Nucleic acid binder design. Structure first.
Length: 211
RNA sequence: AUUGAAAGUUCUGUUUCGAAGAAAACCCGCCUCAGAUU
């Protein structure tokens, strides 16, 4: 298992509109992270034949783990949900075991937007390393699944929903999956939470929980 | 190339007209640069 860390310098903020009134999302979903990662290699094509239908030029990377967190305070607005956080900083962690270290390192230097067109985001630095798997009690900031149990005080658990990879194809709706965010509703911020992780990877001082 | 892809809430308008801070009142009533020199 290998892992990478990125330091993104947002320009004004991202934007993602919920499926099915156009409210947005507090933090980018995993699908957007995977797509932003894949953008580097597929720069110039918007349709690839999956063998049955054209769904997206990102179905290749549908088996990579990723999470992200904020390093500042942001304000959520509805005026089309937006999360204004100009000049802020986003920290994204990729956990993967498919490609070699050089591939991921070069890809991580090839991200220039998360969300829609306007969500320009520079990249400040990247780190690459190995991960050690454990199952003991840990403290984490990156969001996790709804199925994960909680040991600490129930104070900042926000319940949201996401879609599986099946949504990469048009004319279809991805399955709904519950997720938990350790966030403060207003102002937006990131707070640590203790968890009895069954499968968590240590990625250089921060523990990440996936199940 | 990411619930992503595709879009301007934009066009037209005076705060304008008129009205004296004006009239009355003393700085003025007293004082030496003086005595000695080739």
């Amino acid at each position: 298992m290998i892992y990478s860390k990125v330091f993104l310098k947002l320009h004004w903020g991202f934007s993602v509109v919920k499926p099915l009134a156009k409210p947005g999302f507090y933090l980018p979903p995993p699908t957007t992270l995977i797509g932003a990662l894949s953008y580097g290699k597929f720069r110039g094509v918007d349709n690839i034949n999956l063998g049955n239908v054209y769904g997206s030029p990102a179905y290749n990377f549908r088996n990579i783990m990723a999470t992200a967190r904020l390093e500042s305070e942001g304000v959520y607005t509805e005026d089309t949900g937006k999360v204004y956080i100009p000049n802020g900083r986003l920290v994204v962690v990729y956990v993967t075991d498919s490609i070699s270290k050089e591939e991921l390192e070069k890809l991580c230097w090839s991200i220039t937007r998360i969300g829609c067109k306007e969500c320009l985001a520079s990249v400040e630095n990247v780190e690459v390393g190995e991960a050690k798997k454990v199952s003991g009690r840990v403290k984490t900031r990156y969001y996790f699944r709804d199925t994960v149990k909680v040991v600490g005080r129930k104070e900042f658990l926000e319940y949201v929903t996401f879609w599986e990879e099946n949504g990469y194809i048009w004319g279809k709706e991805g399955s709904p999956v519950r997720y938990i965010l350790p966030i403060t509703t207003y102002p937006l911020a990131s707070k640590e939470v203790e968890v009895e992780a069954k499968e968590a990877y240590e990625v250089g001082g921060e523990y990440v929980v996936f199940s």
